[PDB]
Symmetry: D2
Amino acid sequence: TGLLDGKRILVSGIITDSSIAFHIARVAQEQGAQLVLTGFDRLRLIQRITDRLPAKAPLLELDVQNEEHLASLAGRVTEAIGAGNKLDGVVHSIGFMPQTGMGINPFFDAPYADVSKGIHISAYSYASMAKALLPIMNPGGSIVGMDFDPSRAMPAYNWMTVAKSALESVNRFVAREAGKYGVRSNLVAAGPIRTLAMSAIVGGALGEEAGAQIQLLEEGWDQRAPIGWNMKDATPVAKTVCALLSDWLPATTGDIIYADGGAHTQLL
Amino acid sequence: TGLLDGKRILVSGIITDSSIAFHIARVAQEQGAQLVLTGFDRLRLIQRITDRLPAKAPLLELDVQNEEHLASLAGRVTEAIGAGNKLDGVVHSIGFMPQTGMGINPFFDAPYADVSKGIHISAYSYASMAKALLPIMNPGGSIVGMDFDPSRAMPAYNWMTVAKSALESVNRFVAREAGKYGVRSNLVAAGPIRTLAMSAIVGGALGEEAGAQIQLLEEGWDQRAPIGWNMKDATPVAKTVCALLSDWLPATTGDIIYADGGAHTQLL
Amino acid sequence: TGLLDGKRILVSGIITDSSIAFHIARVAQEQGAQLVLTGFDRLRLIQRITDRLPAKAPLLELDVQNEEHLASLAGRVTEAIGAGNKLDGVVHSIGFMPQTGMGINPFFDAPYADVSKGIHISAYSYASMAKALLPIMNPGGSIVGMDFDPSRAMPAYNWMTVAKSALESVNRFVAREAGKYGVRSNLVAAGPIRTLAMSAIVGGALGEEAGAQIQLLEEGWDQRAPIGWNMKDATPVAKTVCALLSDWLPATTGDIIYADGGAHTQLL
Amino acid sequence: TGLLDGKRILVSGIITDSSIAFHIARVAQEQGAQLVLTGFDRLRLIQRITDRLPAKAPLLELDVQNEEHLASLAGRVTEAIGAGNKLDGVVHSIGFMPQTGMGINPFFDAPYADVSKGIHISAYSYASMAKALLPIMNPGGSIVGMDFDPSRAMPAYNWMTVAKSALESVNRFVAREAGKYGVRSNLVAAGPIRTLAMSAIVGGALGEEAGAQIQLLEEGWDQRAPIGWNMKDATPVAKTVCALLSDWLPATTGDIIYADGGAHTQLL
Ligand SMILES: NC(=O)c1ccc[n+]([C@@H]2O[C@H](COP(=O)([O-])OP(=O)(O)OC[C@H]3O[C@@H](n4cnc5c(N)ncnc54)[C@H](O)[C@@H]3O)[C@@H](O)[C@H]2O)c1
Ligand SMILES: NC(=O)c1ccc[n+]([C@@H]2O[C@H](COP(=O)([O-])OP(=O)(O)OC[C@H]3O[C@@H](n4cnc5c(N)ncnc54)[C@H](O)[C@@H]3O)[C@@H](O)[C@H]2O)c1
Ligand SMILES: NC(=O)c1ccc[n+]([C@@H]2O[C@H](COP(=O)([O-])OP(=O)(O)OC[C@H]3O[C@@H](n4cnc5c(N)ncnc54)[C@H](O)[C@@H]3O)[C@@H](O)[C@H]2O)c1
Ligand SMILES: NC(=O)c1ccc[n+]([C@@H]2O[C@H](COP(=O)([O-])OP(=O)(O)OC[C@H]3O[C@@H](n4cnc5c(N)ncnc54)[C@H](O)[C@@H]3O)[C@@H](O)[C@H]2O)c1
Ligand SMILES: Oc1cc(CC2CCCCC2)ccc1Oc1ccc(Cl)cc1Cl
Ligand SMILES: Oc1cc(CC2CCCCC2)ccc1Oc1ccc(Cl)cc1Cl
Ligand SMILES: Oc1cc(CC2CCCCC2)ccc1Oc1ccc(Cl)cc1Cl
Ligand SMILES: Oc1cc(CC2CCCCC2)ccc1Oc1ccc(Cl)cc1Cl
């Protein structure tokens, strides 16, 4: 077995054990992948979490806003996996939007400096990670990023929706570059998952008419999904990412795969 | 290994060894599935083909327009796999449209009797196969059908485009029914594959301004696809179907997966 | 004034004064169009209704399933508008699906004979009306049909959803034919309107878990729509149809215009 | 007559007489609107152009990156139209992306500082113009912006595609805000028009494999469009904008109208 046997895969975005990236890494290891991880601010905090993965993995620092971190990334990764070895997979599982761009802050009140930052981290860095890492990927490789369907507007998500729309567009252009390396680029559009990131905005709208809206949005998902949706279980999305990292979707690129219980295909 | 180890899967639509269903069956067997096959008119012709699959499989007759064939299908399948065993997978890989509905026949000149027949076989039968077989599927099961992206109009495809639009809609409703059984329903939208079905219409427009259009359509696909597209190689699509039949896309239903080299994501 | 001054427009689909076609005709007359109407079974019933339009209009019989009615249509229309005059506009505002294909009947229990009939009337007849009438339309003309967004599945709508998916596809192919005449073809996807057609299925699910679902669907529309939605007011949709019949959307064809309060652009 | 009789409409984005905004203003005046215009850097250059409009209009300076220009805009507009008068329409017809984000510059080589600037001007400013001007719009009003379908990737357009994807998302959120004022927000997705903006990138890829790609893209548009497409004629798009500014699409918001000859609805 091992869906990902022999594959070398870089996984960004682990912060806690609820992190989507955490379960992607876990399942990938269960499936025989050898991992390199990146983490952002609290590397020692991140290391404690990554120590509970089924296997050891080098953990490197990557602030996606940091051009020195980006400039050095490929060298550092090759140091980690061994000269003459290349990556077969890359997982981008990172996002951020300042508080003004989400939750209860009026949409019109977000200053562009804040929006711009969120777009830098959530959308542009998909291209910047691909730039850094494509020169060290094997033909038949796979880059995957995380998306939340922004094709319709909704409460609370606000400027992050705009950043995910940008990301979808970025992914299509990354695919054009990656194809030259024989590499695929896709997003997985996940349904809601109880993660540190959304506890943030769920917590940010406690007394408020955005918290109630978010609750309604969540309940509608499991209702719409023909197979249901369990926000407490990240593994169906981790498995989907691993599917795209495997050799089993070899003809799919510039694309989006919906791991959302089928909710997006149903009006109600 | 065996992506589909232990799974029992019914595969319809084999007619020659170029058949998409043929390569789906082949790869599924290579991955440890145990198959039941159905074939339509020339069962002895179909048997010769299915004898070159890596393993033996019961082959049953199914004319999807035949209510007796449909009424008896589940009993016949259970006879084939053994009382107390159920299906984990179903592949619908069938289509037909009379000559008036495609190629060089003017779009307006197709009589509804012909269109209706093509829709019966290409779209409605997805629901009729699901009706027959869901009562004999295991939770966690997967129904897959074959699609050709009908979201834009194009030369030659004509009324089959309409039938695939109907199919996409049917699939979303099948997913609502299948979810009750814990079963997924999805389509794979494939790029063009050199199959008996399209040699038919490719052959039908030899001297004509539909044959040239078809040639242009085919060349544009490999051009648009960031990873290219090889119309002579059905296995990337077979692998995609097997991915959906596996446990690795467990959160995806009522949906369409594009196995088209990423062509649909690129304008040019 | 007169948005449609001097234009000759055929309007099908009037049955009562709640009919979408009724308000399309009314607004068109208010805007200076000269109309020809078609009606289906109860022509004397239809005549009583059409007598309350602001102006007189010839009313002709057209059963869209009747090849003699279709074969004779263009001659009959030209008789009505005068030799040497041609149509500038055509409104298709017709649909039907037998009771088995909607409401509370299980999706799987609709026989294809019933589905086929609904598709004939709701989707195929768009092409058959275009075939009949394009040879009598002026360059710069406009064909419009009525749609209900079938891009997602939903309760109760069932097989009519499939028929509207087919229609969307038909419209794209009609546009290819109409372009040769300098004629546009588009659909207007309306939000729900209290019409005879949906009182039918609203009435059909009185005690039932499809009636409640329909109520929920309706309430969500006005909730989702940024400008709200009033199911009791057909005129915003009539005005939209007239916009497409006018010279003010001259570059739009094979397309769908959403007159739905913007509901389709919002998740909630 | 006068489709826009009595309406007060602000039109941004005039730079030359080939400007889409120029023809929008012109047609709007021909239809009885009273205009206020805004212009960006070369106000005296812009004034020469705007002097050839059918009627006089106040012209104000607006650099959409300038928070003082934005903060003062509504006061300045009301000064221009008269205390106690409000706007019925707003046209956003502005975009910019630095040279690194388009044409022949590799996609990966655009620094975020450049991308961020283009997104600020092309996408974010749609929200910032709505913020400024909604407090001075009448119920039943209309905000329109200009889009180029970014749903698929393509040569040369590069990071502007990403900025238009963001814009589409912004528009859906603007619609949620505007609905509170009884105001509609929509985009018009135009086919290619020979304008100063694209002569820029057409000129930027003279000897190069992006210039040839752009030529191919342009030729395919008129080929795909069932009614053809004339890149030299901006008026079909101006008329479409005026349609959305009128009372004739009263139920359409958060939406995109395609004024592209129907090219987007056809594969080829
Ligand atoms: N949780 C959900 O319901 C959900 C649904 C769909 C998509 N997503 C997406 O999944 C991805 C992962 O988020 P999550 O929900 O697992 O939340 P999370 O908090 O677990 O992960 C977000 C990660 O982004 C990282 N990050 C922030 N700024 C960074 C930067 N400057 N450089 C490098 N890393 C940075 C954080 O350190 C964190 O590890 C995000 O793109 C999110 O938008 C989440
Ligand atoms: N080949 C392509 O380029 C391509 C691309 C996308 C999608 N598809 C779809 O893939 C599917 C398989 O087609 P293929 O290209 O492998 O061609 P094929 O000729 O190999 O397969 C078509 C099958 O449909 C069966 N069939 C016809 N009428 C039937 C009926 N009454 N009952 C039961 N079976 C019936 C035929 O017997 C044949 O086995 C079709 O749905 C087709 O529309 C094909
Ligand atoms: N009412 C809504 O909420 C709504 C929403 C979106 C789209 N639509 C669509 O609008 C169109 C008009 O329907 P309506 O809601 O105004 O209902 P309606 O009952 O007023 O109109 C339906 C019309 O179809 C005609 N018809 C049925 N079979 C025919 C045939 N054999 N030949 C010719 N005409 C035939 C009927 O005579 C009737 O005039 C339909 O296509 C419907 O699907 C309705
Ligand atoms: N021309 C086309 O083929 C085409 C197709 C689809 C969409 N569009 C869109 O139409 C809109 C108008 O562009 P055009 O093609 O008429 O080109 P144009 O050069 O005529 O117009 C662009 C305008 O944007 C203005 N602008 C730039 N930065 C600004 C800022 N800081 N503040 C205020 N204004 C600023 C310029 O002054 C200019 O007036 C753009 O959004 C463009 O993306 C153009
Ligand atoms: O992209 C996401 C999407 C969701 C689902 C969701 C459904 C409830 C309406 C709101 C959002 C949850 C979390 C998401 O990630 C982030 C969100 C904010 C920041 Cl700051 C960082 C990250 Cl990583
Ligand atoms: O659905 C299909 C799609 C294609 C690809 C293609 C691209 C060239 C423009 C035309 C079609 C090829 C074959 C397809 O299957 C059938 C087609 C006709 C009949 Cl009668 C039966 C079947 Cl199964
Ligand atoms: O196409 C339609 C769509 C709707 C809106 C709606 C929203 C409530 C869920 C259900 C449907 C209402 C009426 C519609 O027309 C018809 C419906 C049935 C027949 Cl038999 C004939 C016609 Cl014309
Ligand atoms: O948004 C646009 C779209 C197009 C059509 C087109 C088709 C040929 C492939 C390329 C682009 C032309 C011009 C466009 O406007 C701008 C472009 C650049 C700048 Cl810097 C500013 C503006 Cl306003």
